[PDB]
């Protein structure tokens, strides 16, 4: 899992990593640029191929709830079973001006806690993402509960850099979605 990712990435030269991020940066700019054109966001395929190392696109760490979990491309059930699903149609989770990454998961599973305690994360709490290019930090600036049908909160916000953690709610009813939103912040690597 994560281990096979950290070690795998460490074996890839700078130039290749660079090339792969640049693909993802361009992909994120396309998504943000369609949004500015008043275009609608559409929320076996390799849209995030460039970011995959051992089938994963990164992992999400959340110290408040002791979770460190691998991110898979796409919101497909078989992925949602082993970790986080990245929502196709939303920014790839490498940061940048005008990016909004969205990651989903099951809020409770006999095999993995996953986002079962996401309701404990509070504004001001931090979460991190490790990807091929390294590690970036977010601080929670918004917590919201929407209907499954309400999509506006998941679109790119021009000028901003965000990632939304999403899961079903209330616990055991799962009739609405809970969104825990982070704002990009600086991250002091040697710490």
Numbering used by the authors: 5 to 47, 60 to 207
Please share text taken word for word from the publication where this structure appeared.
Anchoring of these surface proteins to the cell wall peptidoglycan requires transpeptidase enzymes called sortases, a product of an srt (surface protein sorting) gene. The membrane-associated sortase recognizes the LPXTG motif of the substrate protein, cleaves between the Thr and Gly, and forms an acyl-enzyme intermediate. According to the current model of sortase-mediated pilus assembly, the pilus polymerization catalyzed by a pilus-specific sortase is followed by cell wall anchoring of pilus polymers by the housekeeping sortase. To understand the molecular basis of pilin sorting and pilus anchoring within a bacterial strain, we investigated the housekeeping sortase, GBSSrtA, and a pilus-specific sortase, GBSSrtC1, from the PI-1 pathogenicity island of S. agalactiae SAG 2603 V/R. Either GBSSrtC1 or GBSSrtC2 of this GBS strain is capable of polymerizing GBS80, the pilus shaft of the GBS PI-1 pili.
Therefore, we generated a Cys184Ala mutant of GBSSrtC1, containing the lid mutation (KDPYS to IPNTG), and used this mutant for crystallization. The association of the two GBSSrtC1-lidM monomers observed in the triclinic unit cell, related by a non-crystallographic 2-fold axis, is identical to that observed for the type II and III GBSSrtC1 dimer association. The two monomers of GBSSrtC1-lidM, with an rmsd of 0.63 Å over 164 atoms, display differences around the active site region. Molecule A showed a continuous electron density for the hinge region between H2 and the lid, and this formed an extra helical turn. The lid in both chains was visible up to Leu47, which points inwards into the hydrophobic pocket, positioned precisely as in GBSSrtC1 structures. The low B factors for Leu47 in GBSSrtC1-lidM and its surrounding hydrophobic environment may suggest that the spatial disposition of Leu47 acts as an anchor to the lid. The disposition of Ala184 and the catalytic His122 and Arg193 remained unaffected in the absence of the DP(W/F/Y) motif; however, the orientation of Arg193 side chain was slightly different from that seen in the GBSSrtC1 structures. Because the DP(W/F/Y) motif was dislodged by mutation, the entire elongated groove was potentially available for binding; however, the active site is empty around the catalytic residues.
